[model samples]
Target: TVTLNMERHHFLGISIVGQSNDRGDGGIYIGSIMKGGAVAADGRIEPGDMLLQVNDVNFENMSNDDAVRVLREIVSQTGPISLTVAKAWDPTPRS
Candidate 1:
């Protein structure tokens, strides 16, 4: 697991994707990293990394919408965002 310490900003610079609860494990994953973005500049996080926590909130069997809502709430705040992520061996393949 790794924690990405991002500065206090509104944009995360990454796209969040996930499998639905009925279709898969219902976990939030990184879909893509935007160039010149905060996460892209950080250079530690990668596409397909599973998000385990955002700040103090833990993601447990969270659907895509649920994760999006949580992320939106976090970004709305001015505090720095801390993301806990786990690296996956196969970055592209979800299954």
Candidate 2:
């Protein structure tokens, strides 16, 4: 799901690394970095990545709901979830 530019990939997704989103839109939503392919932000799921499988189940032909379940488990469970992303492209961020 995560893509960098051409062929090279930056793998990562659904991270334990959380973040703060204070939009002041009357909704104080405190959540973790669950960016699909935003590595720079969460760095969990980077770009140019391929979804291998979920819960030991190959995602080559899994249903949408099944995939969702896999993702949900990864987030809900308080442990390290196994994954296979491309390479990590760590770029410096501005403070």
Candidate 3:
């Protein structure tokens, strides 16, 4: 399990949305990262990576209500963005 505590600057530094398989299993996927964004500074994330949580909330197969709450918390900057992610192979972590 790889964990990242990314601070949202004026921007959260990365964009993400839910990704679903044909079977309807879903989880968060990284979309894009700004060149100088907080996440980019860590250099551990990439588009297509699965996000497992935000702060302390598990995101996998999350209910629509929980999804909305996560978005709201991020938009409102309720807390620092702490993410647990699963990458393909090696799944390296960067500082």
Candidate 4:
């Protein structure tokens, strides 16, 4: 589990959108890293990693709207937050 706190739900140096639909392989999958962002700097998370949960709530199998709402709820809590992520298979190729 990776933990951090952001003023807002900052990018976390990863792309959240993808070509795949929720039925195929879509849901807050990390697509890229922000060069100078803390998450990128930490180097624990990488492209293709899937955010399965935030705090204790389940993010897996959730619609983007629900996931965003859950994420926002997490921010409301105090202290560092935890992200349960599943690294994707066949990760997108790097440049």
Best by TM-score: 1
Cα error, residue 59 of model 2, in Å, equals: 2.3
Clashes of 4: 0
- lDDT per residue for candidate 4 within 19-71, as digits (tens), equals 44646566666545575657655654565666646556556656463354446
Is 1 or 3 the stronger prediction by lDDT? 1
Please tell me which model should have the higher lDDT, number 2 or number 3: 3
Clashing pairs in 1: none
**CA shift at 47, candidate 4, in angstroms?**
3.0
Displacement of residue 40 (Cα, Å) in model 3 is: 1.2
Residue 55 displacement in candidate 2 (angstroms): 6.4
Q: Report, for all candidates in order, the number of backbone clashes.
A: 0, 10, 0, 0
Candidate 1, residues 1-95, lDDT tens digits: the string is 45565455545555677766554455677667675656666664565676646766667556444465666666677433677665465544432
Which candidate leads the pack in lDDT? 1
TM-score for each model: 0.64, 0.30, 0.58, 0.54
Model 3 poorest 10 in a row by lDDT = 63-72
RMSD of each: 4.9, 12.8, 4.3, 5.1
Clashing pairs in 4: none
List, residue by residue over 1-95, the lDDT tens digit for candidate 3.
34555355455545566645455345556555564746666674565665545656666656332354565566366655556555444354543
Ranking by TM-score: 1, 3, 4, 2
Please give the range of 10 consecutive residues that has the lowest summed lDDT in model 1: 86-95
